[PDB]
Amino acid sequence: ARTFFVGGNFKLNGSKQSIKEIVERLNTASIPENVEVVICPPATYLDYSVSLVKKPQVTVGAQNAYLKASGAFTGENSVDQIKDVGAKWVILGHSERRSYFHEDDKFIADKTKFALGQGVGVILCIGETLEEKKAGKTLDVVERQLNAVLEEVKDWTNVVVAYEPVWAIGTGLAATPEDAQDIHASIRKFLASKLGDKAASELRILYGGSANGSNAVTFKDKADVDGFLVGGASLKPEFVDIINSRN
Amino acid sequence: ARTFFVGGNFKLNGSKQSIKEIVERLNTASIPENVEVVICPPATYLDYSVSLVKKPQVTVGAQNAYLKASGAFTGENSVDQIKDVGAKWVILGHSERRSYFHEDDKFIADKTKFALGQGVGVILCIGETLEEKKAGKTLDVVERQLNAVLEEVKDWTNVVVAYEPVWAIGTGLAATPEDAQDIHASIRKFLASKLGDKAASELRILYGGSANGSNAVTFKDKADVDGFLVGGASLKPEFVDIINSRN
């Protein structure tokens, strides 16, 4: 009893035309009532995407936001503006911000605090690199990453956490569901100790690697994979296959 | 040439409601004929804002964008998606991005090139800090910032440059119109050594300092300040009088 959650990170992808299509396709599909989908298009299409959604199961979120609501912060996205057009989620700490935009763990910590504070949900991204994986420093990083927000955030009833196998992206290594089962279970235990087994038992831990149409079922029987944070496949029709990979 | 340009950068501020009132005011205002006005809302509101302007003189721009149109850059803004939505400009290099997100000179130059590729125009920001000003290295700071862009783009038909005296912000220090004239004259004398005087005499150099309703009027008769990159004045009734100042 953890509601299956499916998130779709469009990344720097979409157009009014393609998004329309993407959303019109949900709206229109058979999707369980008891699944939680959140689509996260560029900030440029947030208002627009909202307009378009008609199924109770889906919401939209932003792919980043700052740690202040307003002020002199040219080029950022605010959680106030994201709630203003009806978005309900924010993705924080994605590997692409961590690497390319060198957001540190305290940055994300602060960003998470602030957003949960303003009433928006947070999809928090953790995971290690190849270098880091090869030195078997995987549990280290991930608890280090989680520890920084644990410092600021005491509640977590509105956080979903997604693990991203960064070592498995463009490296030529592949993550199996067994790899994922393992790491999530582990992650869970860690959080059980900091938060209590009740709070940890209800928290969703999303698998964040290459999950797609063909795969998604592969992970239907892994008890600690509560859903997915999909990349490329979210901009495609296989997206709906994912949403139904359980039944 | 040198048609007066007035960009209003809203920074992280606005709601659907308030961007409606500022546009409406703009729609009904009796502001001059050859005047270029660009409003710069939060990404969240570009579509919407475009939808409301009905005035040949006013256009819209974004506050920052990546150096790629699409891909795996979660959280970023794309010049192509800014285009799809109908905005025409992007501010690149603002002191707030150069500082808190530390966009170095080369990133800026890279993003200027690109956006031009794609067809949007750029409001390129440059400015020295105080410390740099104290060392009397304003001219070297500004040249160095501009050269990075000269390196990559040789046609600035589409670039207006914004001069921000970051050293007059917060500091207790104040920039005069005469200050402005001096500097602009100097960055103009310098882009001519490199872009030929014709190109230079056609380049609009804006004052991105604290320009408001009440002092906008003091820069008239400053021959090298072709306009303004306004700030908080932007979200208020007096943006209009800034607009009508050259009159």
Swiss-Prot record, chains A, B:
Gene3D superfamilies: Aldolase class I. The active site is at residues 94, 164. The modification Phosphoserine is found at residues 70, 214. One of its GO terms (biological process) is gluconeogenesis. One of its GO terms (cellular component) is plasma membrane. Pathway: Carbohydrate biosynthesis; gluconeogenesis; Carbohydrate degradation; glycolysis; D-glyceraldehyde 3-phosphate from glycerone phosphate: step 1/1. The modification Phosphothreonine is found at residue 3. One of its GO terms (molecular function) is triose-phosphate isomerase activity. It catalyses: D-glyceraldehyde 3-phosphate = dihydroxyacetone phosphate. The keyword Transmembrane helix does not apply. Pfam families: TIM. Substrate binds at residues 9, 11. Keywords: Gluconeogenesis, Glycolysis, Isomerase, Isopeptide bond, Phosphoprotein, Ubl conjugation. The keyword Endoplasmic reticulum does not apply. Its EC number is 5.3.1.1. There is a cross-link at residue 222 (Glycyl lysine isopeptide (Lys-Gly) (interchain with G-Cter in ubiquitin)). Belongs to the triosephosphate isomerase family. PANTHER family: TRIOSEPHOSPHATE ISOMERASE (PTHR21139:SF41). Homodimer. Present with 207000 molecules/cell in log phase SD medium. This is Triosephosphate isomerase. It comes from Saccharomyces cerevisiae (strain ATCC 204508 / S288c) (Baker's yeast). The gene is TPI1.
